[PDB]
Amino acid sequence: VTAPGNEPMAIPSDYKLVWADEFNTPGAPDAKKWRYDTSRNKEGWYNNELQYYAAGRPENVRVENGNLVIETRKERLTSMADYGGQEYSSGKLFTQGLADWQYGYVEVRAKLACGKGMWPAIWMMASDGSTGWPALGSIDIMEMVAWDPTTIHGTIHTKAYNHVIHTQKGSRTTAADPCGQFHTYSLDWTKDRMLIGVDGHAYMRFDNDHKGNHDTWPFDSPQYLILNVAIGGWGGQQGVDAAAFPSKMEVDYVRVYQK
Ligand SMILES: OC[C@H]1O[C@@H](O[C@H]2[C@H](O)[C@@H](O)[C@H](O[C@@H]3[C@@H](O)[C@@H](O)O[C@H](CO)[C@H]3O)O[C@@H]2CO)[C@H](O)[C@@H](O)[C@@H]1O
Numbered sequence: 625v626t627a628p629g630n631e632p633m634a635i636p637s638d639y640k641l642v643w644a645d646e647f648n649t650p651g652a653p654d655a656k657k658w659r660y661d662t663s664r665n666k667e668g669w670y671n672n673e674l675q676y677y678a679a680g681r682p683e684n685v686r687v688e689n690g691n692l693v694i695e696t697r698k699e700r701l702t703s704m705a706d707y708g709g710q711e712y713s714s715g716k717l718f719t720q721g722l723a724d725w726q727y728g729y730v731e732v733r734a735k736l737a738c739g740k741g742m743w744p745a746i747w748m749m750a751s752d753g754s755t756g757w758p759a760l761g762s763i764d765i766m767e768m769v770a771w772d773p774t775t776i777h778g779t780i781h782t783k784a785y786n787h788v789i790h791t792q793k794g795s796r797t798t799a800a801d802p803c804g805q806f807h808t809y810s811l812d813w814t815k816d817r818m819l820i821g822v823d824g825h826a827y828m829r830f831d832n833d834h835k836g837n838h839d840t841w842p843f844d845s846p847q848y849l850i851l852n853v854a855i856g857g858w859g860g861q862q863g864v865d866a867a868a869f870p871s872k873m874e875v876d877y878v879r880v881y882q883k
């Protein structure tokens with residue numbers, strides 16, 4: 625644990641709900657709120673990931689019964705022009721180009737995708753990617769790898785602090801049946817620090833050292849929100865279980881609060 629936290633977190637009294645997807649409207653996700661990422665479908669995604677991210681394909685991404693569903697399936701989508709030879713299909717939505725925020729309280733109420741192989745993530749990257757990943761800054765509000773399906777990881781990545789050179793600032797907790805019941809995964813982002821939590825408890829704290837160094841604190845610029853279920857890489861440490869497909873993360877809501 626490299627960024628330990630141990631404090632309550634709650635939507636601050638002086639914050640307003642400024643953006644939300646309650647996923648009230650069945651069908652396609654709202655195009656004013658999400659776009660699909662197909663950027664590396666043909667090439668293969670990073671982290672040696674095994675999924676194809678299917679755009680506009682209800683089998684992988686749909687709003688149903690108040691939830692965003694992101695669903696992994698074992699299938700080869702060979703009719704897709706950007707098909708990259710993948711054994712699996714999944715979904716990746718982001719608010720890139722639609723919505724971002726500089727500081728704020730983010731609350732995502734979600735049931736995760738389980739099964740050896742599955743790697744559900746709720747995270748943020750900076751709107752200004754001029755510095756690239758990992759320099760731009762990225763916030764992992766929730767990662768789980770389903771070989772360890774009760775363990776919730778909360779992580780930040782910057783130039784100084786990132787997985788590529790094993791200096792990432794993160795922590796972990798556990799949650800009851802995270803693929804069978806809903807938890808709130810939460811980020812409290814101020815100019816001074818980040819808390820990352822489950823259910824109103826921060827297990828993760830990263831402070832702005834206030835040195836004005838982009839390397840250690842790139843978090844004074846807007847960030848957009850990302851929802852996906854990756855397959856393989858970190859999620860594939862105890863292999864990929866054919867039997868576990870299909871597997872789905874249900875997102876009840878995304879709610880963003882600001883001063
Ligand atoms: O490898 C260099 C390329 O990185 C691309 O950035 C990726 C990065 O490679 C990848 O490892 C990273 O993965 C993320 C996880 O490690 C963790 O942060 O949680 C995220 C949710 O699981 C997960 O996807 O993502 C980076 C951004 O996609 C650069 O985009 C590319 O320009 C560069 O050459």
Ligand SMILES: [Ca+2]
Nearest residue numbers: 646690876877
């Ligand atoms: Ca809902």
